[PDB]
Design a protein around this ligand. Sequence first.
Ligand SMILES: CC[C@H](CO)Nc1nc(NCc2ccccc2)n2ncc(C(C)C)c2n1
Lengths: 264, 268
Amino acid sequence: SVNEVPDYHEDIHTYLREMEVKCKPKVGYMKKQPDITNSMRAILVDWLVEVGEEYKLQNETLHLAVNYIDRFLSSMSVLRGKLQLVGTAAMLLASKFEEIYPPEVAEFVYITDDTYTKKQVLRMEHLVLKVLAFDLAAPTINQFLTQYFLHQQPANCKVESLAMFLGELSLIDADPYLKYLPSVIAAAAFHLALYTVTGQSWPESLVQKTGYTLETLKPCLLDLHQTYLRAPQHAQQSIREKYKNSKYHGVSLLNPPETLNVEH
Amino acid sequence: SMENFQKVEKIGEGTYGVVYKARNKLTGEVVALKKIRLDTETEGVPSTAIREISLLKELNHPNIVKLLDVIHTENKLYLVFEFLHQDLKKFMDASALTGIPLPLIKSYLFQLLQGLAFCHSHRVLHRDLKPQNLLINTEGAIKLADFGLARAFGVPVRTYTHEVVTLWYRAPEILLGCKYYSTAVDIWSLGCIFAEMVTRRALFPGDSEIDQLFRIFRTLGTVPPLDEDGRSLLSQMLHYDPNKRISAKAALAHPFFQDVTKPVPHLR
Ligand SMILES: CC[C@H](CO)Nc1nc(NCc2ccccc2)n2ncc(C(C)C)c2n1
């Protein structure tokens, strides 16, 4: 209907595809941050998921904050004891951008266990805005997924939730996921989720839309399959906890497919 | 920071902040400054600012007001805009007795649709199209302004803020509180504005939400001086059903705009 925006979805898809390239953080930014690591980032991103659950925020909000963080850290050296302040400011900024009812600032100070002060959060907010030069309308894995869901015949709630879940898992591990674009991560996630539940493939309709085939999506699939397989053993666990709920149909409790199949 | 700029007069107050006419003492350029106070002990940079700035930096079109610069301080945020000489509301009021020439009306609608189509092409709802937020110059251009209430939507849309467009320009799907609303709400608005350019008075000047609804039901069932073409487009811009309602992109291809030009507005 009009809610699926038929006169504009093609135009919109092209622009998101064009913008995700310009909002992409630098691939090896962690190699240049002398005080912080990938592991540390994983703690942070996982903690944001917990924040997302407690305050019942939109997943889009989570994906944006992660983009804000990676971009900030792609240009600013941050010490370990300030990583969470950045992260908190990112979540606030993302909330304000995306949420109908963003949590008030005091609520963001609360979840940082009073490690930081209200003023610090407020100052970091402005700092994040400057570094990102107010460019906050970044395309996310979610914005692509939600478009791909329109190509289901018919719609499957287990798939959508599983697609959400996998794409979400990628936010945790900068290695490797920093080197894939949101649209690609979404594409792999969608295939992998669809194949698990129903048993079928990345649809032909979405091949003419994206220009992505499984052969182009191969490297990403393999990495995402790995992560899926390993997920129960991962240090960070909040995404699996989140996706055990009836809300998300418990798709994290499903068994990952042993193999995918694809080569001569 | 603002040493270069010289305040001339107060322009007024948008959805947020305060707007001034100002001149760059060095270049001679006349600008409009949207001044935004922060808010540092509470509550931060307002989401209206964050959205307008983030979006308007992206959107670069002849029919969308141009954001020139963003100037920071610790306590004040100054948006530097291109100045436009007046708004559609004052122009219509100025043209209450004379009328607005039709080829001008056609032009303004054509441009408003071009600007809006560019918004919709880039996943942006404006959500506050009223004649006060539509700016005209002396060259003949009209532009969409104040993106303070704008939002970057997704495909498909989800539930957005309800308290969203000013009563008189509000689409029925917002009035009746339908969980989803989309690009159609902006079309509805331009529809009411089209009508308003012809008659030089609001089409549905409701006193309340109920009244607003009833006024809509009267007219469309439950604008005299306009040609057959004009009415067709109008009623397609004001379809009850948001799915049936015309898109801006399709509106530009209407026979109504076949002979369109770009006249200079009568009056200063
Ligand atoms: C957007 C609504 C704004 C709020 O008063 N009005 C307004 N009016 C004019 N110009 C028409 C006008 C109105 C009153 C007095 C002089 C000129 N301009 N010119 C540039 C801008 C930017 C801030 C968008 C702007 N905003």
